[PDB]
Amino acid sequence: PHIGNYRLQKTIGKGNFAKVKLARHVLTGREVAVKIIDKTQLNPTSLQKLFREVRIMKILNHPNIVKLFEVIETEKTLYLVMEYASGGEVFDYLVAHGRMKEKEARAKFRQIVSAVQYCHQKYIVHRDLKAENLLLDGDMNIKIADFGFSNEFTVGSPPYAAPELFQGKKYDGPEVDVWSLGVILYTLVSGSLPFDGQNLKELRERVLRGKYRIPFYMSTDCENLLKKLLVLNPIKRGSLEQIMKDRWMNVGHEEEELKPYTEPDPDFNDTKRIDIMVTMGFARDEINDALINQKYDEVMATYILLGRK
Structure with missing residues (x-):
């Protein structure tokens, strides 16, 4: 059972509107935590609120705060791929x-x-x-x-x-x-x-x-x-x-x-990580935009994951 580049493994927590699954990133093999959130059932204020947390997770870059790696999102569902x-x-x-x-x-x-x-x-x-x-x-x-x-x-x-x-x-x-x-x-x-x-x-x-x-x-x-x-x-x-x-x-x-x-x-130019991503199929333009524009997509998430653990 997969979402995006992630193989989902055990559930490690259910809550009312969120479910955290442990998972593995199939491109790089990193272990990550994926917070699955139903957005179909959310009143506008829960949605406003959901999106505020997401903004904050997006800017927290600290060796002692859990990093956010990727956001995968459909009309129905938000996946936040984050550090485990x-x-x-x-x-x-x-x-x-x-x-x-x-x-x-x-x-x-x-x-x-x-x-x-x-x-x-x-x-x-x-x-x-x-x-x-x-x-x-x-x-x-x-x-x-x-x-x-x-x-x-x-x-x-x-x-x-x-x-x-x-x-x-x-x-x-x-x-x-x-x-x-x-x-x-x-x-x-x-x-x-x-x-x-x-x-x-x-x-x-x-x-x-x-x-x-x-x-x-x-x-x-x-x-x-x-x-x-x-x-x-x-x-x-x-x-x-x-x-x-x-x-x-x-x-x-x-x-x-x-x-x-x-x-x-x-550092968006780590040549080691870029060479790996080029070998994987990604384009250098693609890597760079993803990085400078902080998209949290499959590409940016890959470059970050290649940098850990």
Whole structure:
């Protein structure tokens, strides 16, 4: 069962209006994830919304955000061919494998913070970073998916969730992120959540008091970094750019200081990939238009896939 250049393999998620199939690209043999979406049943507002996500997926180009590779589209159906993070969610990972040494925890936090910062540079995020947004790929690299998206086209309140959200106030930016980001680190480095309890009333009591103990192996840099994230009043919280500069963030990176992400100049002329595509049947004009005009068609999708994994 194929769509376009993709052999569809197992289903990995159904949701109301979307189905994510794992798949293999028959030209290059890359594994990808294909989100199949019925568009026949969509009121105009769901359609407007569908197409906004698509625009955003189109511009997110980051080594730690899931890439979009191809859009194949009929009157009835939208297929979005996207990067596959084979490794699950980061919270599960920790629950399943325990804490990480600071060095691995940093590499992952670096990727996270940079991806979250970058999203903000690129669109306006209207909802909180969520556990289901933090994935790992086959090589333990972070990949953020759908940051700030509705879950219409997805497939009480969380332990990993700003204290002021337990006050009912809507998401207001890199401010709520910072708290979440603090819970991530706490767990990344300690294996356990910084706040918990039996039920809604223990969790909330705990979170809003915001006391936590650190484990004795956590380094002072790390504890210090945490003192900038897990902070009750949202205005006392470090900005993302300010977080990037923290000491713990840069241990081992004293030359390569963490910095807001800037997209490199895109390479549309990789001669290796082009030679392969010419051997495959594609024309050099075809490759180039596809690339410069970002069509997300069979051709552009091929050149991208030839560049990974």
